[PDB]
Amino acid sequence: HPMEKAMLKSAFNFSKDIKKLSKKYKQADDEFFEELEDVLIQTDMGMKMVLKVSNLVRKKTKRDTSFENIKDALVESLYQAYTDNDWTNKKYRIDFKENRLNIFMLVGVNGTGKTTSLAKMANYYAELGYKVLIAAADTFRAGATQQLEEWIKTRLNNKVDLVKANKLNADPASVVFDAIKKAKEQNYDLLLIDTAGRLQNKTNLMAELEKMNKIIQQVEKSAPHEVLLVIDATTGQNGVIQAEEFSKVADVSGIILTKMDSTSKGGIGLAIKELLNIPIKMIGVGEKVDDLLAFDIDQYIVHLSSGFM
């Protein structure tokens, strides 16, 4: 299992702290709850999540509960804080249908994280037999196109093709126009678009994303079907805070949390839910093209808390 791999370093860090907490344990009093709070702070779930989880654990326990039961309450509380006790099958689902042109847009601060994620998304669907198109529309970013050409050239299934800018028109919107046209005419199942724009200039980002919306919506009214924000898990609570600025200026529908295997901070997923309230749909587990999997909250919680259960 890749969730083993995704959660390993953060599962180790969380249980180290919880296990250290077990030595000192006597009652579930005021002081204990304070030490438990500091352990939760350390997962980087962010202060609101820390208070929610702590207060849930405290409501599920009594002064004279045993530690084994503290942990079960903890695991329950983490899960309830994340899912917020709701039906998540639709929420976390990538909206991909079989008899239409599916058009997903990718957004994110790191331009290499976007191209790597686009490539990995394209291979996920190309491997399931579908016909995939990539639109290299981040034309103002030096190297972005070259990155996507190399993915296609050496790591992608040959059911993935690419549309890039020429010389005369290197407007982002122009690449998206050619891509849509081509995607419809040649019966592609999925168009993946590397959007343009920086947070630096949010009028500009909003403008570029809107030109793009108009263009695709003249062919698939319901598009974009997905607007996916790439968040690097190693950037922690600060990168999540920065990511907020993105959803506020774009109609983001899901998150691709990359490099989860490189972080010791298993609270990142609850921080995202708290600060963005946008479901994580994919999670990146390694550096190879197929190191990307659909996100599953139970596997996430199970693996996060595996070290102490």
**What would the 3-class secondary structure string for 250-304 be?**
CCCCEEEEECHHHCCCCCHHHHHHHHHCCCEEEEECCCCCCCEEECCHHHHHHHH
Q: Hey, which CATH number is domain 93-309, 3.40.50.720, 3.30.1520.10, 3.40.50.300, 3.60.15.10? A: 3.40.50.300
Domain boundaries, the chain: 1-92, 93-309
What gap in Å lies between CA 309 and CA 78, rounded to an integer? 14
Closest C-alpha to 227, from 104, 96, 102? 104
- At how many Å resolution was this determined? 2.4
> Which residues lie across from 161 on neighbouring strands?
133
Query: Hey, what are 230's tokens?
Result: 């790439």
Edge-to-edge order in the sheet of strand 102-107: 160-164, 132-136, 190-194, 102-107, 226-232, 254-258, 280-284, 292-294
Q: Token pair 């180290």 is at which residue? A: 16
Instruction: Decide if domain 1-92 falls under CATH 1.20.120.140.
Output: yes
Give me the amino acid identity at 212: M
Q: Token pair 């200039």 is at which residue? A: 201
